[PDB]
Amino acid sequence: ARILAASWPQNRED
Amino acid sequence: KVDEYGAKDYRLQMPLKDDHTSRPLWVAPDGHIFLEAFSPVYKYAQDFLVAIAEPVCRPTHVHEYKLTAYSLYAAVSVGLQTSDITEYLRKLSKTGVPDGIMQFIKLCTVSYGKVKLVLKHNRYFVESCHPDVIQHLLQDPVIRECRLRNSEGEATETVSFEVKQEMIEELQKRCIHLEYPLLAEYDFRNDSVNPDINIDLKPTAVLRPYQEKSLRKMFGNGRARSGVIVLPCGAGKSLVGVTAACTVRKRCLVLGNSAVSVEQWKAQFKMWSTIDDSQICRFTSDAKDKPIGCSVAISTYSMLGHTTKRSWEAERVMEWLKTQEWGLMILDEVHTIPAKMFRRVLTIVQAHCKLGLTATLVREDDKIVDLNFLIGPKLYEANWMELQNNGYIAKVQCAEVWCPMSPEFYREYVAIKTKKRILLYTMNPNKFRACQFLIKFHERRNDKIIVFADNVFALKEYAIRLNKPYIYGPTSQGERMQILQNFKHNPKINTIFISKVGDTSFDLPEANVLIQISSHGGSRRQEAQRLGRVLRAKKGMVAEEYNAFFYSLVSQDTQEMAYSTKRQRFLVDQGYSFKVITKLAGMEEEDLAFSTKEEQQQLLQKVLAATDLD
Amino acid sequence: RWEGGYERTWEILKE
Amino acid sequence: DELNLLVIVVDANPIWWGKQALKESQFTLSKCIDAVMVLGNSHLFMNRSNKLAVIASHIQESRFLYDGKYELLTSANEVIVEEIKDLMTKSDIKGQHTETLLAGSLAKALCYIHRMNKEVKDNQEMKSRILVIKAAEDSALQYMNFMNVIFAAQKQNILIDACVLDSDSGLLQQA
Amino acid sequence: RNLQEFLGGLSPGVLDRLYGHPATCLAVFRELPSLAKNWVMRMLFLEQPLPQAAVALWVKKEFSKAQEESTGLLSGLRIWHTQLLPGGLQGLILNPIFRQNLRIALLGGGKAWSDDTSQLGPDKHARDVPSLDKYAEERWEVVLHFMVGSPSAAVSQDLAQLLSQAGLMKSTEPGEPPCITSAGFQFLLLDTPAQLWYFMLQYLQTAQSRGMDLVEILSFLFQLSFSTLGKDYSVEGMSDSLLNFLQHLREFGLVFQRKRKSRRYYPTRLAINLSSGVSGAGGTVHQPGFIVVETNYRLYAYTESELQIALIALFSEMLYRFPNMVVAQVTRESVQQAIASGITAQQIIHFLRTRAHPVMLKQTPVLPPTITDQIRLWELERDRLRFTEGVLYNQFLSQVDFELLLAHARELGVLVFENSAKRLMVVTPAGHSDVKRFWKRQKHSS
Amino acid sequence: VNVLKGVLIECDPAMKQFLLYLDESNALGKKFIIQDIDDTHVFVIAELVNVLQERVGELMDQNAFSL
Fold first, then answer.
1. Cβ pair F14:A3 closer than 8 A
2. Contact B396, B550 (CB under 8 A)
3. D17 lies in which domain range?
4. Which cysteine pairs are joined by S-S bonds (chain F)?
């Protein structure tokens, strides 16, 4: 779930 | 003149006057018109623009309209001259009207209403009050061929002359070249060859103000005029057609896409019109009725356009139709008319007044310029947002959900460059999980769910894994009707999977949640019409601005992004908003399929097993 | 029988 | 948007201050006036949004009091000094009334606060507090009016601070 | 950077010299926290040092952090100081010069900074407050147009030299107008009070370059902060450096002066709020919003000045240029071009919110959330590729050695990325030499 | 020791797979993607990363529409 939930639009938003 | 930033320097050609706030209109010399909705004279300006200008975009604040020769001809046919229109434009334009637009209006309006085409005794005559124009047009070689001639080849001698039926559509295009468009005027009250029909309007039928305005605009000076009226799906378009047919009182012909459309039109006629059932006949391939005494005939374009040999009874019905003169003809879904076979149906059928109804007119093949003469100019088009405010239609909540592509699929997605690439992004396991979560949420919310997927394999796989009814190509009509009734009545089943056939092949039951997974490839109008037809107004949530839910599942970093962006342009031009949702709240708590990555590997194996054949 | 005529030209007037 | 209002009511009873002057004590009315002016200047100094209202409580009536030094502070001091001198020089004892009009000054201060709050725009909230200095003896006949003022102040939720100098008053304690 | 941050980084001598101005003390007190204000008011007449424990016992235990913040702010500004109180105590006592000037300002006395300019009588060519405000707007408009490079704005060369020193515009080729950098774009996208505050901060950072006294300039700015709008004051009584600074401010429009020889000068509201920086002036009555944003990413501007047209064209594609209207479209290409120019998404969003039309203000959201989210996504698209140069270590034969080297690298602070599972790591190229030497020395000791 | 000097690139796994496809198919030409270090981190020689960024930008440009 780590890959899917935070692939593109999370490493910059979070 | 163009500035370095690309803006058109229209300051010099537009003399601005001090009446800024009072006058709401901007009239650029390029033909575009800009209107401010917050202006107190917005309603008057809106009414004036709709009559004369074809809208381009209608967002919340500033609306953009376009001026076209067809729009000018429609305005002239309404009964407005150049002087009053110019006066109203100058009273509403913030700046002075450029002379280029003024000369453009002057040239078009004078040339309108000159040439008249009359269909009498199953014969087409071209006549005008100016024989000089008629004599001048005789020199045209195309007009020479279109003009009907004697059996010996001699040309036939307000003087009128017979014109070949097979060359009628050719003559329509030639009128544009000669700048003398034909006039679609019918003797609404002076008709005597075709007797009236015992058909009236039931008291249960109520005409909405915009519907009544459109009908009155169509009936210019009390005479029915051929044209096209655009109304949103579910706004009683069939009711408007029935009302127009009752008003005409003459022979009526209606054409639909399939037998379901024919049945719906017949039901609406029985629901609103007073015509006896014996005078209503269905010229369908399965349910056939005798054409004798058929006051109103409902059929399909392909039935009339069947180039292959037809059945013996169908041949007799076609012969009777050709012999019979039809005062009024009704065509549904005008957007498919630009097809050559369906256009040939117009030549085949002899009708005096032709009215076309549909939801959209932006063909992806842009074959609409010829359509402007196949039937006529667009008579009316209602504002979707305004009707939403009036409560006539549901205020749809639209959203685009971005489903990340799995790395295994993504590498294969980039590797594949042919048309087989569709299966990869249409079968995203993450998209599957998102759709499953949405279905669970809406079932817990007790909502009607319609899942649309153009791809047959993807739709079937999704429906099978989610254990929901699936509708596809064959879909035997008895089973299709049973599934529809179960969706309407059974509360246990509220999720129906529908293939591409859900656009016009059958009637869409009223629902509230519509999820689009697969795309045609850039059908900007087809899916918009499908969305309009799927969702209708629902009582109980009228006060809320979000009573209908539409979701578009789009694969990130794929070509589906471009398809969605191109497609939603039409809806954005209507002011419809689209919110991008990358994260779905509640998926973490809820348990969904393909939780483990190995399950996604199994799905990848299954998809790869489905080769380019599927 | 209201289809005979309908116009809003006079509504477009200076006030 | 924080508007802090500090309304100051000064017990200007001439009898008590005259008796104190007869005692030749270190503290006089001049020192009290200087302290009040300094406190008001500091209150306006702490923030622009802060506002100051000074009303003199005298037996005859209640008087609305309001070079290297700040212009606004200098103007306020000059106005205050002018008003107090005008009141005291014209304060003629005509009658046996000795108890200061405490209730009337409080009522006028509350009316001024209400007018300011109405004049205060909705963009800002005007917090109000009242400080009163007690020098002379308390008034018994003003008990009902004092209680009515207390109830109105509590209804408007305005803090009331009492500064007793010589004679204690249980009414101030209850307020 | 706020005013106190610049003040807190000054040398003790500059702070002591500024303390000699009562207006400076008033400004410093006004900029203090409420608890700090109460502490200063308590210590205004305290001629004896205060034990630190006694000072600390005043505040609540929960508000100790706020108490410590105020104490640290007061210590950094050198408002007070610690003294070796007899008996081993460390008393706290305010600055005698600062305290004396504060008492002079509040209690009275001293001497007025301005010598009552009414001596010259009424001004024959006096202006009005709206005229002064308009002139202040015009001057900054000229400055911004010159920064854009339009020929209609002609300013002094030294003014452009300040920008070159500020780095907003770099003169790559002499003779030609300098090209404005990304920092210049960010400055342009800032709000006008923010632009003025940043420009004045940059001027202060290079004040010593012009040989101008920092103490005099700061005190003069503080005095102008408390000045009355629409009121003139005496030019006389100021040093030649102060006269030059006043002329510079007149060129900026902050100060109105009909002639260079005039003895009067009218401070403007911009100069009044200049000391406060960006905050303080929460009720700024700016120009009404002329920008209307539609759901189709279309912008309609009810403006005619080329400054706003250029600002809009910085990140949008112009479509039509009407005499009283400008029609443009928000496009991904233009937004990406602006981002490559150094423009951030937040600056565009804030600027559009500032120029929000009153019709759009009726909506509960100031701007359509979908458009803002699309702009944010376009901004995030640019920085998808993260470039980080470094040296990769991947030949670790022992886990213990890898852990030891990782610990040493984290001690050195040169670690870029670590992978304990595969025993792989990335270090900075500058720190690569140190880590390489440490690794070799470990083998040497083995 | 045998260690290479280049630039570390951190991206989402989708971009990692795209870069792996480019390196394997030799669309970039010569194999400048010498070695992968982590599921989201790669080590690229700086001589080709500039061109590689252009290729990545071309990919996202195609996954969009031109207005």
1. no
2. yes
3. 3-175
4. none
Residues of chain B contacting C10 with CB distance shorter than 8 Å: none
Which chain F residues are within 8 Å of E391, Cβ to Cβ?
3, 5
One-letter identity of residue E8: G
Q: How many domains does chain F have?
A: 1
Best mutation target, F10, F11, F12, F59, to test chain A (most A CBs within 10 A): F12
Residue ranges making up the domain that contains F60: 3-64
Buried b (16+ CB within 10 A) or exposed e, E143-169: bbbbbbeeeebeeeeeebebbeebebb
Output the six-digit token pair for E46: 């305290």
Give the CA dihedral D152, D155, D157, D162, nearest 10 degrees. Answer: 30
Point out which residues pair with D127 in neighbouring strands: D4
CB atoms within 10 A of CB D82: 11
Q: How far apart are CA E130 and CA E122, in angstroms?
A: 19
Instruction: Give the Cα separation of B41 and D2 in Å (integer).
Output: 43
Contact list in E for residue F43 (CB cut-off 8 A) is 392, 426
Residue E391: beta bridge partners? E427, F5
Neighbour tally for D107: CB within 10 Å:
16
Residue F29: CATH number of its domain: 3.30.70.1220
Backbone angle region of B197, left / alpha / beta, with phi > 0 → left and psi within -120 to 50 → alpha: beta
Half-sphere exposure of F18 (CA within 13 A, CB side): 20
> CA angle at residue E59 from E53 to E61, to 5 degrees?
90
Q: What does the block give as tokens for B182?
A: 């034909």
Q: Partners for D (CB, 8 Å, 3+ pairs)?
A: E
Containing H/E element for B107? Answer: helix B99-111
- Cα gap B109→E286, rounded to integer Å: 48
**CA separation for the pair D103, E296 (Å, rounded):** 66
Closest-CA residue in chain F for A6? F12
Q: Please give the method by which this entry was determined.
A: cryo-EM
- Neighboring chain B residues of A1 at a CB cutoff of 8 Å: 588, 595
Q: What token pair was written down for D68?
A: 């290297």
| B148 φψ region: left (φ > 0), alpha (ψ -120 to 50), beta (else) | beta
- Exposure class string for B159-196: b at 16+ Cβ within 10 A, else e: ebbbbebebbbebbebbbebebbbbbbbbbeebeebee
The 10 Å Cβ neighbour count of residue B477 is 12
Q: How many domains does chain D have?
A: 1
Which residues on chain B place their C-beta less than 8 Å from a C-beta of chain C? 44, 47-48, 51, 78-80, 84, 88, 91-92, 212-213, 215-219, 221-222, 247
